[PDB]
Specification:
Two copies of one chain form a homodimer. By secondary structure, chain A is α/β, with parallel strands linked by helices. The first copy, chain A, has helices spanning 17-28, 47-55, 76-89, 112-117, 170-175, 191-197, 209-212, and strands spanning 5-11, 34-40, 60-64, 99-102, 108-109, 123-125, 128-131, 134-142, 145-150, 166-169, 206-207, 217-218. In chain A, 24% of the residues lie in helices and 23% in strands. Chain A is globular. Chains A, B: Pathway: Protein modification; protein glycosylation.
Chain lengths: 242, 242
């Protein structure tokens, strides 16, 4: 049947959290054979997220792992938690079909993207809107192959692409058990390149979204929520989760 | 018969526009019998929106109406254009059960809310998250009746509620052909209240979301897109729509 698409999503408690998960789930819920690995940045599963997944209507795995005392890129620990669960979930048996991609909880996805990453054999890539201080970022394709990168942040990277711009075959993840994300790098956005370097080469990259000429995913961060008028002493007569 | 839900969505061209329209559609696409009325704030229809609705995957009406200069309200013209259109199409029909609500293009909706507003007879209301400087605002309900409002702003309004917090039956809109939103409102924050006042009474309001104790809709806004790295001179050889 259709190979399973695993979505690794790190998340953390904040005012807009439930709203972001709600609309992301509204998109993922429509994807056939998708499994959502939602990883909370916390010492324990929160009731909010536990309740959400129970009512979300789509297969999921609820994980949690705290991010130590860390303008540095986060979610590194949560993403690795997803990788660990996956590599541990699949035994050295004989059935390892599937693909995975990394989806932050506030990123916007077009349903067209999944049919693209679904066929990933090694590592596929695609354009990402609103990132790197530019309208978009995308790998440059030549005769079906990646031969360059268009990005406003560190274009010298052997893999100058954003976390939201690629998918990795489950087999590739299982075959490279040592391949994880490492934030040790002083360079903020070097995690994706350092990771990808251990699994494939630019030549093996599978260009998606019409040879990388279409934006099917966008970075969308919501503005900080204004709570200036939130009551502290004369509270509402009921408790409401938001 | 199954009542049709009409979503009146005001929108305007900006870098995150397509992204926002993409995820709202991903939500609406899953609602049975829902007609999306997208109203552009422009002199004429835009190609991006026109092409988007063509492949959005759900029934819709593409309208457009300019808005004079106008910290002033917005979407007033677009929402009225939506009201006019509805009154026109159903200028005189028989079995035409329906309900409408106002959905900005950046708001988040839980699928559970539609089932609620579906049965609206006159006007229904519910809690709205992340609005008015608080975690939520909501109608106060006692014995199935709205007896007040929880909001830190102009609480003395006859209807101290947010635009995303109510739905009106199609019959109420038709029966009151002159009831529209007034931009001329010199007093700020009175749009919702002035509209509803000439349409229903507080005693007639139909409380939803478990007697207004659950938050199923949220205000969410994407931060301003950073383009500090957008190439001035040189550019990409290929045109990419974001």
């Amino acid at each position: 049947q259709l190979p399973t698409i695993y979505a690794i999503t790190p998340t953390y408690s904040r005012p807009v959290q439930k709203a972001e998960l709600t609309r992301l789930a509204n998109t993922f819920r429509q994807v056939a054979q998708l499994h959502w690995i939602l990883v909370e940045d916390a010492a324990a599963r929160s009731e909010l997220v536990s309740r959400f997944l129970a009512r979300a209507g789509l297969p999921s795995t609820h994980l949690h792992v705290p991010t130590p005392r860390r303008g540095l890129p986060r979610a590194t620990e949560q993403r690795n938690a997803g990788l660990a669960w996956l590599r541990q979930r699949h035994q050295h048996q004989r059935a390892q079909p599937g693909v995975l991609f990394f989806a932050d909880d506030d990123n916007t996805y077009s349903l067209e993207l999944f049919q693209e990453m679904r066929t990933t054999r090694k590592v596929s890539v695609w354009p990402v809107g609103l990132v790197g201080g530019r309208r978009y970022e995308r790998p440059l394709v030549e005769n079906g192959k990646v031969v360059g990168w268009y990005t406003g942040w560190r274009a010298d990277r052997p893999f100058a692409i954003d976390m939201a711009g690629f998918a990795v075959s489950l087999q590739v993840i299982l075959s490279n058990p040592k391949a994880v994300f490492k934030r040790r790098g002083s360079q903020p956005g070097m995690q994706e390149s350092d990771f990808l370097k251990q699994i494939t080469t630019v030549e093996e990259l599978e260009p998606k979204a019409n040879n990388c000429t279409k934006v099917l995913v966008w970075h969308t961060r919501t503005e900080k929520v204004n709570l200036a008028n939130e009551p502290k002493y004369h509270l509402d007569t009921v408790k409401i989760e938001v």
